[PDB]
Amino acid sequence: SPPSIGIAVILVGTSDEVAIKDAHEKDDFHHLSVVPRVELVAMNETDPKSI
Amino acid sequence: IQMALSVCEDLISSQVYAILVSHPPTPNDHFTPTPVSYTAGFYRIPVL
Amino acid sequence: ARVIILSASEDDAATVYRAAAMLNMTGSGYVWLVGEREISGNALRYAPDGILGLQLINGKNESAHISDAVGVVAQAVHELLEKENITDPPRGCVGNTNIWKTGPLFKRVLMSSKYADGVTGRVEFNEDGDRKFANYSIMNLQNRKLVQVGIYNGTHVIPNDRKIIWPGGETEKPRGYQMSTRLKIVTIHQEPF
């Protein structure tokens, strides 16, 4: 109920994306009840205005 | 954030050779060269 | 020792001035010294007498600085147009993130040039990108009002004429040091000594 899991992982190199999402949901941490709502993004040639 | 966005928009629309930055008339004399120092600095352009 | 060099925020400067004035410390022979921020604003109100301070000759004239800046960038641009193998400034902050090839090169010319005549004196840049050879207006708190006494040219100090007042009257200059004739010796047990 107290999630506090507003996390986000963003990559700008598009390196090992499949392995990143595969291990993203692989282990449970019930001792730290967080409801891990995560996100993802792709490379966009990170520029000041773009970033 | 708005100043950084407008700085990027200006350098996009002006391709400046050198940008001058002033002080704000709303005290807090530390946030003046916050946006232009690192926003219009990615291309290594002189700032005054 | 007597002299007390200070540098802090003006809001904190008022509090430390009040704390110093609480004790019988500011006066007699305890000559102070401060910068420029902690001498203006509210900090001047709680400051005591006998405060020697600092002040730039030209720090608020925006128009003169603008004119000098535009002149120096114009002269640098005119000096660097004769170069070769140059690129145009990048177009776009939205979909482009690179480094201008001619960016750093400009540095090697913009801080290595002379402005010659200027309304704010000569314009020269140290090897950091900062202004050097400034003129400071030495200042003294006389009768609860600021008054100029002495000025700086950048290299040597120039006392104007009017007499500065050290804290608590006593127009004679204090020595700035004393001697504590109450030293505490130490020993250790020994038979014959």
Side-chain angles (χ1 to χ4, degrees), chain B residues 8 10-11 13-18 20 22-23 42-48, chain C residues 62 69 73 77 88-93 96 98-100 103-104 106-107 110:
Chain B
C8 266
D10 179 25
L11 63 93
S13 42
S14 47
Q15 59 178 330
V16 70
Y17 263 43
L20 329 181
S22 93
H23 66 82
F42 264 50
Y43 290 117
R44 223 63 36 79
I45 186 84
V47 187
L48 169 37
Chain C
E62 203 148 27
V73 47
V77 161
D88 86 315
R91 224 63 186 101
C93 211
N96 227 307
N98 304 271
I99 167 173
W100 210 38
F106 203 178
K107 252 47 187 201
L110 39 62

PDB file of all heavy atoms in Angstrom, chain B residues 8-18 20 22-23 42-48, chain C residues 62 69 73 77 88-93 96-100 103-104 106-107 110, unseen atoms left out:
ATOM      1  N   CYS B   8      18.211  26.718 -25.492  1.00  0.00           N
ATOM      2  CA  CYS B   8      18.350  25.749 -26.577  1.00  0.00           C
ATOM      3  C   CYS B   8      17.564  26.186 -27.805  1.00  0.00           C
ATOM      4  O   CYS B   8      18.045  26.056 -28.937  1.00  0.00           O
ATOM      5  CB  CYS B   8      17.897  24.359 -26.129  1.00  0.00           C
ATOM      6  SG  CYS B   8      19.217  23.282 -25.520  1.00  0.00           S
ATOM      7  N   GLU B   9      16.351  26.706 -27.604  1.00  0.00           N
ATOM      8  CA  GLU B   9      15.546  27.163 -28.733  1.00  0.00           C
ATOM      9  C   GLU B   9      16.213  28.329 -29.453  1.00  0.00           C
ATOM     10  O   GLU B   9      16.185  28.405 -30.688  1.00  0.00           O
ATOM     11  CB  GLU B   9      14.147  27.553 -28.257  1.00  0.00           C
ATOM     12  N   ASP B  10      16.811  29.252 -28.697  1.00  0.00           N
ATOM     13  CA  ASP B  10      17.474  30.403 -29.298  1.00  0.00           C
ATOM     14  C   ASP B  10      18.703  29.979 -30.089  1.00  0.00           C
ATOM     15  O   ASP B  10      18.867  30.370 -31.250  1.00  0.00           O
ATOM     16  CB  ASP B  10      17.847  31.413 -28.212  1.00  0.00           C
ATOM     17  CG  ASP B  10      18.563  32.631 -28.766  1.00  0.00           C
ATOM     18  OD1 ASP B  10      18.379  32.944 -29.961  1.00  0.00           O
ATOM     19  OD2 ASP B  10      19.309  33.279 -28.003  1.00  0.00           O
ATOM     20  N   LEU B  11      19.578  29.170 -29.482  1.00  0.00           N
ATOM     21  CA  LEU B  11      20.762  28.721 -30.210  1.00  0.00           C
ATOM     22  C   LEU B  11      20.382  27.842 -31.395  1.00  0.00           C
ATOM     23  O   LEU B  11      21.131  27.766 -32.375  1.00  0.00           O
ATOM     24  CB  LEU B  11      21.726  27.983 -29.276  1.00  0.00           C
ATOM     25  CG  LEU B  11      21.306  26.679 -28.594  1.00  0.00           C
ATOM     26  CD1 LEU B  11      21.720  25.470 -29.419  1.00  0.00           C
ATOM     27  CD2 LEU B  11      21.911  26.600 -27.200  1.00  0.00           C
ATOM     28  N   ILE B  12      19.229  27.175 -31.323  1.00  0.00           N
ATOM     29  CA  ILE B  12      18.716  26.446 -32.475  1.00  0.00           C
ATOM     30  C   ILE B  12      18.282  27.415 -33.567  1.00  0.00           C
ATOM     31  O   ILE B  12      18.476  27.155 -34.761  1.00  0.00           O
ATOM     32  CB  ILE B  12      17.561  25.522 -32.049  1.00  0.00           C
ATOM     33  N   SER B  13      17.689  28.540 -33.179  1.00  0.00           N
ATOM     34  CA  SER B  13      17.165  29.515 -34.126  1.00  0.00           C
ATOM     35  C   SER B  13      18.135  30.650 -34.432  1.00  0.00           C
ATOM     36  O   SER B  13      17.822  31.497 -35.274  1.00  0.00           O
ATOM     37  CB  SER B  13      15.848  30.099 -33.601  1.00  0.00           C
ATOM     38  OG  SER B  13      15.927  30.366 -32.211  1.00  0.00           O
ATOM     39  N   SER B  14      19.298  30.696 -33.781  1.00  0.00           N
ATOM     40  CA  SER B  14      20.244  31.783 -34.003  1.00  0.00           C
ATOM     41  C   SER B  14      21.682  31.343 -34.234  1.00  0.00           C
ATOM     42  O   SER B  14      22.462  32.150 -34.757  1.00  0.00           O
ATOM     43  CB  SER B  14      20.225  32.768 -32.822  1.00  0.00           C
ATOM     44  OG  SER B  14      20.280  32.084 -31.583  1.00  0.00           O
ATOM     45  N   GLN B  15      22.054  30.112 -33.881  1.00  0.00           N
ATOM     46  CA  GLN B  15      23.426  29.598 -33.976  1.00  0.00           C
ATOM     47  C   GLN B  15      24.438  30.662 -33.540  1.00  0.00           C
ATOM     48  O   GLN B  15      25.292  31.119 -34.300  1.00  0.00           O
ATOM     49  CB  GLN B  15      23.728  29.042 -35.376  1.00  0.00           C
ATOM     50  CG  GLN B  15      23.590  29.999 -36.559  1.00  0.00           C
ATOM     51  CD  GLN B  15      23.954  29.349 -37.880  1.00  0.00           C
ATOM     52  OE1 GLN B  15      24.792  28.448 -37.934  1.00  0.00           O
ATOM     53  NE2 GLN B  15      23.320  29.801 -38.955  1.00  0.00           N
ATOM     54  N   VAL B  16      24.311  31.049 -32.268  1.00  0.00           N
ATOM     55  CA  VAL B  16      25.022  32.211 -31.753  1.00  0.00           C
ATOM     56  C   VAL B  16      26.535  31.990 -31.766  1.00  0.00           C
ATOM     57  O   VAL B  16      27.030  30.861 -31.658  1.00  0.00           O
ATOM     58  CB  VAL B  16      24.519  32.534 -30.333  1.00  0.00           C
ATOM     59  CG1 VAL B  16      24.975  31.470 -29.342  1.00  0.00           C
ATOM     60  CG2 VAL B  16      24.975  33.912 -29.898  1.00  0.00           C
ATOM     61  N   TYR B  17      27.275  33.090 -31.925  1.00  0.00           N
ATOM     62  CA  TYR B  17      28.729  33.079 -31.819  1.00  0.00           C
ATOM     63  C   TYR B  17      29.210  33.318 -30.394  1.00  0.00           C
ATOM     64  O   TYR B  17      30.311  32.882 -30.038  1.00  0.00           O
ATOM     65  CB  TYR B  17      29.334  34.144 -32.739  1.00  0.00           C
ATOM     66  CG  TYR B  17      29.807  33.622 -34.077  1.00  0.00           C
ATOM     67  CD1 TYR B  17      29.044  32.717 -34.802  1.00  0.00           C
ATOM     68  CD2 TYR B  17      31.013  34.045 -34.619  1.00  0.00           C
ATOM     69  CE1 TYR B  17      29.474  32.245 -36.028  1.00  0.00           C
ATOM     70  CE2 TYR B  17      31.450  33.578 -35.843  1.00  0.00           C
ATOM     71  CZ  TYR B  17      30.676  32.678 -36.543  1.00  0.00           C
ATOM     72  OH  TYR B  17      31.108  32.209 -37.762  1.00  0.00           O
ATOM     73  N   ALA B  18      28.414  34.016 -29.584  1.00  0.00           N
ATOM     74  CA  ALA B  18      28.734  34.278 -28.186  1.00  0.00           C
ATOM     75  C   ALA B  18      27.495  34.788 -27.461  1.00  0.00           C
ATOM     76  O   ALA B  18      26.806  35.683 -27.959  1.00  0.00           O
ATOM     77  CB  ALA B  18      29.876  35.290 -28.066  1.00  0.00           C
ATOM     78  N   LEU B  20      25.727  36.372 -23.967  1.00  0.00           N
ATOM     79  CA  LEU B  20      25.939  37.119 -22.736  1.00  0.00           C
ATOM     80  C   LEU B  20      24.799  36.841 -21.766  1.00  0.00           C
ATOM     81  O   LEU B  20      23.637  36.741 -22.168  1.00  0.00           O
ATOM     82  CB  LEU B  20      26.042  38.621 -23.011  1.00  0.00           C
ATOM     83  CG  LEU B  20      26.621  39.076 -24.354  1.00  0.00           C
ATOM     84  CD1 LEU B  20      26.667  40.594 -24.420  1.00  0.00           C
ATOM     85  CD2 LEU B  20      28.008  38.496 -24.586  1.00  0.00           C
ATOM     86  N   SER B  22      23.082  37.829 -17.868  1.00  0.00           N
ATOM     87  CA  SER B  22      22.970  38.864 -16.852  1.00  0.00           C
ATOM     88  C   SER B  22      22.468  38.272 -15.538  1.00  0.00           C
ATOM     89  O   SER B  22      22.212  37.070 -15.419  1.00  0.00           O
ATOM     90  CB  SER B  22      22.038  39.979 -17.323  1.00  0.00           C
ATOM     91  OG  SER B  22      20.711  39.734 -16.890  1.00  0.00           O
ATOM     92  N   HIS B  23      22.332  39.149 -14.538  1.00  0.00           N
ATOM     93  CA  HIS B  23      21.811  38.894 -13.206  1.00  0.00           C
ATOM     94  C   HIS B  23      20.303  39.126 -13.170  1.00  0.00           C
ATOM     95  O   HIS B  23      19.774  39.938 -13.937  1.00  0.00           O
ATOM     96  CB  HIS B  23      22.492  39.805 -12.187  1.00  0.00           C
ATOM     97  CG  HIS B  23      22.172  41.257 -12.364  1.00  0.00           C
ATOM     98  ND1 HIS B  23      21.019  41.831 -11.874  1.00  0.00           N
ATOM     99  CD2 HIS B  23      22.852  42.251 -12.981  1.00  0.00           C
ATOM    100  CE1 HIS B  23      21.003  43.116 -12.179  1.00  0.00           C
ATOM    101  NE2 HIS B  23      22.105  43.396 -12.852  1.00  0.00           N
ATOM    102  N   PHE B  42      27.377  22.920 -24.246  1.00  0.00           N
ATOM    103  CA  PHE B  42      27.614  21.601 -24.822  1.00  0.00           C
ATOM    104  C   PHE B  42      28.426  21.691 -26.105  1.00  0.00           C
ATOM    105  O   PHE B  42      29.207  20.783 -26.411  1.00  0.00           O
ATOM    106  CB  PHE B  42      26.285  20.896 -25.087  1.00  0.00           C
ATOM    107  CG  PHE B  42      25.870  19.954 -23.996  1.00  0.00           C
ATOM    108  CD1 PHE B  42      25.862  20.368 -22.675  1.00  0.00           C
ATOM    109  CD2 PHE B  42      25.493  18.654 -24.289  1.00  0.00           C
ATOM    110  CE1 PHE B  42      25.481  19.506 -21.668  1.00  0.00           C
ATOM    111  CE2 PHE B  42      25.111  17.786 -23.285  1.00  0.00           C
ATOM    112  CZ  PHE B  42      25.106  18.213 -21.972  1.00  0.00           C
ATOM    113  N   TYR B  43      28.254  22.769 -26.863  1.00  0.00           N
ATOM    114  CA  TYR B  43      28.978  22.979 -28.108  1.00  0.00           C
ATOM    115  C   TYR B  43      30.268  23.765 -27.912  1.00  0.00           C
ATOM    116  O   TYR B  43      30.933  24.090 -28.900  1.00  0.00           O
ATOM    117  CB  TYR B  43      28.079  23.693 -29.120  1.00  0.00           C
ATOM    118  CG  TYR B  43      26.945  22.840 -29.639  1.00  0.00           C
ATOM    119  CD1 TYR B  43      25.622  23.190 -29.404  1.00  0.00           C
ATOM    120  CD2 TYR B  43      27.196  21.682 -30.366  1.00  0.00           C
ATOM    121  CE1 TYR B  43      24.581  22.413 -29.878  1.00  0.00           C
ATOM    122  CE2 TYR B  43      26.163  20.900 -30.844  1.00  0.00           C
ATOM    123  CZ  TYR B  43      24.857  21.270 -30.596  1.00  0.00           C
ATOM    124  OH  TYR B  43      23.825  20.493 -31.069  1.00  0.00           O
ATOM    125  N   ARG B  44      30.626  24.079 -26.665  1.00  0.00           N
ATOM    126  CA  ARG B  44      31.852  24.809 -26.339  1.00  0.00           C
ATOM    127  C   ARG B  44      31.879  26.171 -27.036  1.00  0.00           C
ATOM    128  O   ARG B  44      32.776  26.486 -27.822  1.00  0.00           O
ATOM    129  CB  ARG B  44      33.091  23.976 -26.691  1.00  0.00           C
ATOM    130  CG  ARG B  44      34.192  24.020 -25.642  1.00  0.00           C
ATOM    131  CD  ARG B  44      33.731  23.428 -24.315  1.00  0.00           C
ATOM    132  NE  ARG B  44      32.826  22.298 -24.488  1.00  0.00           N
ATOM    133  CZ  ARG B  44      33.209  21.067 -24.795  1.00  0.00           C
ATOM    134  NH1 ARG B  44      34.485  20.763 -24.972  1.00  0.00           N
ATOM    135  NH2 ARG B  44      32.290  20.116 -24.928  1.00  0.00           N
ATOM    136  N   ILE B  45      30.873  26.976 -26.730  1.00  0.00           N
ATOM    137  CA  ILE B  45      30.706  28.309 -27.302  1.00  0.00           C
ATOM    138  C   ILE B  45      30.984  29.330 -26.204  1.00  0.00           C
ATOM    139  O   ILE B  45      30.584  29.108 -25.056  1.00  0.00           O
ATOM    140  CB  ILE B  45      29.295  28.500 -27.899  1.00  0.00           C
ATOM    141  CG1 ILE B  45      29.180  29.836 -28.635  1.00  0.00           C
ATOM    142  CG2 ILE B  45      28.215  28.363 -26.836  1.00  0.00           C
ATOM    143  CD1 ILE B  45      29.685  29.781 -30.059  1.00  0.00           C
ATOM    144  N   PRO B  46      31.698  30.419 -26.493  1.00  0.00           N
ATOM    145  CA  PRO B  46      32.019  31.389 -25.437  1.00  0.00           C
ATOM    146  C   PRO B  46      30.773  32.003 -24.816  1.00  0.00           C
ATOM    147  O   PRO B  46      29.796  32.311 -25.501  1.00  0.00           O
ATOM    148  CB  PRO B  46      32.862  32.445 -26.166  1.00  0.00           C
ATOM    149  CG  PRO B  46      32.662  32.180 -27.632  1.00  0.00           C
ATOM    150  CD  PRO B  46      32.416  30.715 -27.742  1.00  0.00           C
ATOM    151  N   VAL B  47      30.825  32.185 -23.497  1.00  0.00           N
ATOM    152  CA  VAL B  47      29.750  32.796 -22.724  1.00  0.00           C
ATOM    153  C   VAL B  47      30.349  33.892 -21.855  1.00  0.00           C
ATOM    154  O   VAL B  47      31.383  33.686 -21.208  1.00  0.00           O
ATOM    155  CB  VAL B  47      29.006  31.759 -21.854  1.00  0.00           C
ATOM    156  CG1 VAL B  47      27.786  32.393 -21.202  1.00  0.00           C
ATOM    157  CG2 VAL B  47      28.607  30.546 -22.681  1.00  0.00           C
ATOM    158  N   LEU B  48      29.700  35.055 -21.834  1.00  0.00           N
ATOM    159  CA  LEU B  48      30.199  36.228 -21.128  1.00  0.00           C
ATOM    160  C   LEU B  48      29.231  36.602 -20.012  1.00  0.00           C
ATOM    161  O   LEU B  48      28.019  36.688 -20.236  1.00  0.00           O
ATOM    162  CB  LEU B  48      30.387  37.407 -22.094  1.00  0.00           C
ATOM    163  CG  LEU B  48      30.654  38.819 -21.550  1.00  0.00           C
ATOM    164  CD1 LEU B  48      31.544  38.802 -20.322  1.00  0.00           C
ATOM    165  CD2 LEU B  48      31.277  39.680 -22.610  1.00  0.00           C
TER     166      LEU B  48
ATOM    167  N   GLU C  62      25.826  48.906 -15.594  1.00  0.00           N
ATOM    168  CA  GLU C  62      25.558  47.861 -16.577  1.00  0.00           C
ATOM    169  C   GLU C  62      25.910  48.314 -17.990  1.00  0.00           C
ATOM    170  O   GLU C  62      26.440  47.530 -18.785  1.00  0.00           O
ATOM    171  CB  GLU C  62      24.090  47.440 -16.497  1.00  0.00           C
ATOM    172  CG  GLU C  62      23.814  46.050 -17.039  1.00  0.00           C
ATOM    173  CD  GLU C  62      22.677  45.356 -16.314  1.00  0.00           C
ATOM    174  OE1 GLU C  62      21.794  46.056 -15.775  1.00  0.00           O
ATOM    175  OE2 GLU C  62      22.667  44.108 -16.284  1.00  0.00           O
ATOM    176  N   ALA C  69      31.911  44.740 -23.330  1.00  0.00           N
ATOM    177  CA  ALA C  69      31.738  43.359 -23.758  1.00  0.00           C
ATOM    178  C   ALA C  69      31.497  43.269 -25.257  1.00  0.00           C
ATOM    179  O   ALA C  69      32.101  42.437 -25.946  1.00  0.00           O
ATOM    180  CB  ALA C  69      30.578  42.748 -22.990  1.00  0.00           C
ATOM    181  N   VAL C  73      34.065  41.394 -27.907  1.00  0.00           N
ATOM    182  CA  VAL C  73      33.669  40.278 -28.763  1.00  0.00           C
ATOM    183  C   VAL C  73      33.793  40.674 -30.230  1.00  0.00           C
ATOM    184  O   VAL C  73      34.203  39.864 -31.071  1.00  0.00           O
ATOM    185  CB  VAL C  73      32.254  39.766 -28.423  1.00  0.00           C
ATOM    186  CG1 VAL C  73      31.272  40.895 -28.291  1.00  0.00           C
ATOM    187  CG2 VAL C  73      31.775  38.771 -29.477  1.00  0.00           C
ATOM    188  N   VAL C  77      36.172  38.699 -32.864  1.00  0.00           N
ATOM    189  CA  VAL C  77      35.616  38.148 -34.097  1.00  0.00           C
ATOM    190  C   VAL C  77      36.357  38.700 -35.307  1.00  0.00           C
ATOM    191  O   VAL C  77      36.680  37.963 -36.247  1.00  0.00           O
ATOM    192  CB  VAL C  77      34.104  38.432 -34.172  1.00  0.00           C
ATOM    193  CG1 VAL C  77      33.598  38.292 -35.600  1.00  0.00           C
ATOM    194  CG2 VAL C  77      33.344  37.500 -33.239  1.00  0.00           C
ATOM    195  N   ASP C  88      30.707  26.337 -39.443  1.00  0.00           N
ATOM    196  CA  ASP C  88      29.600  27.171 -39.012  1.00  0.00           C
ATOM    197  C   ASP C  88      29.104  26.714 -37.641  1.00  0.00           C
ATOM    198  O   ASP C  88      29.312  25.564 -37.245  1.00  0.00           O
ATOM    199  CB  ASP C  88      28.469  27.128 -40.039  1.00  0.00           C
ATOM    200  CG  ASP C  88      27.524  25.957 -39.828  1.00  0.00           C
ATOM    201  OD1 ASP C  88      28.004  24.827 -39.602  1.00  0.00           O
ATOM    202  OD2 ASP C  88      26.296  26.171 -39.897  1.00  0.00           O
ATOM    203  N   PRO C  89      28.468  27.607 -36.886  1.00  0.00           N
ATOM    204  CA  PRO C  89      27.897  27.197 -35.606  1.00  0.00           C
ATOM    205  C   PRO C  89      26.825  26.153 -35.807  1.00  0.00           C
ATOM    206  O   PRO C  89      26.106  26.156 -36.827  1.00  0.00           O
ATOM    207  CB  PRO C  89      27.319  28.505 -35.041  1.00  0.00           C
ATOM    208  CG  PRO C  89      27.271  29.456 -36.191  1.00  0.00           C
ATOM    209  CD  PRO C  89      28.380  29.060 -37.097  1.00  0.00           C
ATOM    210  N   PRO C  90      26.678  25.220 -34.865  1.00  0.00           N
ATOM    211  CA  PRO C  90      25.696  24.144 -35.033  1.00  0.00           C
ATOM    212  C   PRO C  90      24.272  24.678 -35.059  1.00  0.00           C
ATOM    213  O   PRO C  90      23.947  25.685 -34.425  1.00  0.00           O
ATOM    214  CB  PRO C  90      25.935  23.251 -33.811  1.00  0.00           C
ATOM    215  CG  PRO C  90      26.555  24.159 -32.801  1.00  0.00           C
ATOM    216  CD  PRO C  90      27.402  25.115 -33.587  1.00  0.00           C
ATOM    217  N   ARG C  91      23.419  23.984 -35.807  1.00  0.00           N
ATOM    218  CA  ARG C  91      22.018  24.355 -35.975  1.00  0.00           C
ATOM    219  C   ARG C  91      21.153  23.344 -35.231  1.00  0.00           C
ATOM    220  O   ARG C  91      21.034  22.190 -35.656  1.00  0.00           O
ATOM    221  CB  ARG C  91      21.644  24.409 -37.455  1.00  0.00           C
ATOM    222  CG  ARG C  91      20.803  25.613 -37.845  1.00  0.00           C
ATOM    223  CD  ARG C  91      21.561  26.908 -37.621  1.00  0.00           C
ATOM    224  NE  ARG C  91      20.728  28.080 -37.865  1.00  0.00           N
ATOM    225  CZ  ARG C  91      20.156  28.801 -36.911  1.00  0.00           C
ATOM    226  NH1 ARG C  91      20.305  28.499 -35.632  1.00  0.00           N
ATOM    227  NH2 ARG C  91      19.415  29.853 -37.249  1.00  0.00           N
ATOM    228  N   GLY C  92      20.554  23.777 -34.125  1.00  0.00           N
ATOM    229  CA  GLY C  92      19.593  22.949 -33.423  1.00  0.00           C
ATOM    230  C   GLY C  92      20.059  22.394 -32.094  1.00  0.00           C
ATOM    231  O   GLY C  92      21.149  21.823 -31.994  1.00  0.00           O
ATOM    232  N   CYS C  93      19.235  22.566 -31.059  1.00  0.00           N
ATOM    233  CA  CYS C  93      19.445  21.913 -29.774  1.00  0.00           C
ATOM    234  C   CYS C  93      18.546  20.698 -29.586  1.00  0.00           C
ATOM    235  O   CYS C  93      18.716  19.968 -28.605  1.00  0.00           O
ATOM    236  CB  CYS C  93      19.211  22.903 -28.619  1.00  0.00           C
ATOM    237  SG  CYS C  93      20.228  22.576 -27.145  1.00  0.00           S
ATOM    238  N   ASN C  96      20.431  17.369 -32.141  1.00  0.00           N
ATOM    239  CA  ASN C  96      21.860  17.401 -32.420  1.00  0.00           C
ATOM    240  C   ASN C  96      22.616  17.544 -31.110  1.00  0.00           C
ATOM    241  O   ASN C  96      22.289  18.413 -30.295  1.00  0.00           O
ATOM    242  CB  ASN C  96      22.213  18.551 -33.369  1.00  0.00           C
ATOM    243  CG  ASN C  96      23.131  18.118 -34.495  1.00  0.00           C
ATOM    244  OD1 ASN C  96      24.186  17.530 -34.258  1.00  0.00           O
ATOM    245  ND2 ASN C  96      22.733  18.408 -35.728  1.00  0.00           N
ATOM    246  N   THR C  97      23.621  16.692 -30.912  1.00  0.00           N
ATOM    247  CA  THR C  97      24.448  16.743 -29.704  1.00  0.00           C
ATOM    248  C   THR C  97      25.868  16.346 -30.110  1.00  0.00           C
ATOM    249  O   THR C  97      26.206  15.161 -30.155  1.00  0.00           O
ATOM    250  CB  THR C  97      23.905  15.836 -28.612  1.00  0.00           C
ATOM    251  N   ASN C  98      26.687  17.351 -30.403  1.00  0.00           N
ATOM    252  CA  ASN C  98      28.071  17.143 -30.800  1.00  0.00           C
ATOM    253  C   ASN C  98      28.914  18.241 -30.163  1.00  0.00           C
ATOM    254  O   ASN C  98      28.452  18.981 -29.289  1.00  0.00           O
ATOM    255  CB  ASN C  98      28.204  17.118 -32.329  1.00  0.00           C
ATOM    256  CG  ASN C  98      27.315  16.074 -32.977  1.00  0.00           C
ATOM    257  OD1 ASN C  98      27.716  14.925 -33.157  1.00  0.00           O
ATOM    258  ND2 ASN C  98      26.097  16.470 -33.327  1.00  0.00           N
ATOM    259  N   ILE C  99      30.164  18.347 -30.606  1.00  0.00           N
ATOM    260  CA  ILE C  99      31.092  19.361 -30.126  1.00  0.00           C
ATOM    261  C   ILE C  99      31.567  20.177 -31.320  1.00  0.00           C
ATOM    262  O   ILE C  99      31.993  19.612 -32.334  1.00  0.00           O
ATOM    263  CB  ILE C  99      32.282  18.734 -29.372  1.00  0.00           C
ATOM    264  CG1 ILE C  99      33.394  19.765 -29.165  1.00  0.00           C
ATOM    265  CG2 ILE C  99      32.800  17.503 -30.107  1.00  0.00           C
ATOM    266  CD1 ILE C  99      34.526  19.275 -28.290  1.00  0.00           C
ATOM    267  N   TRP C 100      31.477  21.498 -31.204  1.00  0.00           N
ATOM    268  CA  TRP C 100      31.943  22.374 -32.271  1.00  0.00           C
ATOM    269  C   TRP C 100      33.458  22.279 -32.396  1.00  0.00           C
ATOM    270  O   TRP C 100      34.185  22.422 -31.409  1.00  0.00           O
ATOM    271  CB  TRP C 100      31.518  23.815 -31.993  1.00  0.00           C
ATOM    272  CG  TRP C 100      31.282  24.628 -33.223  1.00  0.00           C
ATOM    273  CD1 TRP C 100      30.713  24.208 -34.389  1.00  0.00           C
ATOM    274  CD2 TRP C 100      31.602  26.012 -33.409  1.00  0.00           C
ATOM    275  NE1 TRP C 100      30.663  25.242 -35.291  1.00  0.00           N
ATOM    276  CE2 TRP C 100      31.202  26.361 -34.713  1.00  0.00           C
ATOM    277  CE3 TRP C 100      32.189  26.988 -32.599  1.00  0.00           C
ATOM    278  CZ2 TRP C 100      31.371  27.646 -35.226  1.00  0.00           C
ATOM    279  CZ3 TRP C 100      32.356  28.262 -33.111  1.00  0.00           C
ATOM    280  CH2 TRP C 100      31.948  28.580 -34.411  1.00  0.00           C
ATOM    281  N   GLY C 103      35.107  25.629 -31.657  1.00  0.00           N
ATOM    282  CA  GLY C 103      34.758  26.190 -30.374  1.00  0.00           C
ATOM    283  C   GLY C 103      35.959  26.514 -29.508  1.00  0.00           C
ATOM    284  O   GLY C 103      36.232  27.679 -29.199  1.00  0.00           O
ATOM    285  N   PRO C 104      36.697  25.483 -29.084  1.00  0.00           N
ATOM    286  CA  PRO C 104      37.875  25.728 -28.235  1.00  0.00           C
ATOM    287  C   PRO C 104      38.928  26.610 -28.884  1.00  0.00           C
ATOM    288  O   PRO C 104      39.605  27.367 -28.176  1.00  0.00           O
ATOM    289  CB  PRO C 104      38.414  24.315 -27.962  1.00  0.00           C
ATOM    290  CG  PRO C 104      37.769  23.435 -28.993  1.00  0.00           C
ATOM    291  CD  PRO C 104      36.435  24.046 -29.260  1.00  0.00           C
ATOM    292  N   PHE C 106      38.559  29.263 -30.652  1.00  0.00           N
ATOM    293  CA  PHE C 106      38.201  30.643 -30.336  1.00  0.00           C
ATOM    294  C   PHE C 106      38.812  31.075 -29.011  1.00  0.00           C
ATOM    295  O   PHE C 106      39.310  32.201 -28.888  1.00  0.00           O
ATOM    296  CB  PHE C 106      36.677  30.783 -30.296  1.00  0.00           C
ATOM    297  CG  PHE C 106      36.177  32.187 -30.513  1.00  0.00           C
ATOM    298  CD1 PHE C 106      34.817  32.449 -30.540  1.00  0.00           C
ATOM    299  CD2 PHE C 106      37.057  33.241 -30.691  1.00  0.00           C
ATOM    300  CE1 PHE C 106      34.346  33.733 -30.739  1.00  0.00           C
ATOM    301  CE2 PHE C 106      36.592  34.527 -30.891  1.00  0.00           C
ATOM    302  CZ  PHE C 106      35.235  34.773 -30.915  1.00  0.00           C
ATOM    303  N   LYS C 107      38.824  30.172 -28.025  1.00  0.00           N
ATOM    304  CA  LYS C 107      39.404  30.486 -26.725  1.00  0.00           C
ATOM    305  C   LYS C 107      40.807  31.054 -26.880  1.00  0.00           C
ATOM    306  O   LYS C 107      41.105  32.158 -26.407  1.00  0.00           O
ATOM    307  CB  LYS C 107      39.426  29.235 -25.844  1.00  0.00           C
ATOM    308  CG  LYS C 107      38.420  29.244 -24.705  1.00  0.00           C
ATOM    309  CD  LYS C 107      37.043  29.669 -25.178  1.00  0.00           C
ATOM    310  CE  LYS C 107      36.091  29.827 -24.006  1.00  0.00           C
ATOM    311  NZ  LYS C 107      34.673  29.756 -24.441  1.00  0.00           N
ATOM    312  N   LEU C 110      40.443  34.681 -27.844  1.00  0.00           N
ATOM    313  CA  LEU C 110      39.569  35.669 -27.214  1.00  0.00           C
ATOM    314  C   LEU C 110      40.133  36.187 -25.897  1.00  0.00           C
ATOM    315  O   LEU C 110      39.883  37.342 -25.535  1.00  0.00           O
ATOM    316  CB  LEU C 110      38.154  35.113 -27.009  1.00  0.00           C
ATOM    317  CG  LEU C 110      37.845  33.677 -26.583  1.00  0.00           C
ATOM    318  CD1 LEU C 110      38.418  33.355 -25.214  1.00  0.00           C
ATOM    319  CD2 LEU C 110      36.341  33.437 -26.600  1.00  0.00           C
TER     320      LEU C 110
END
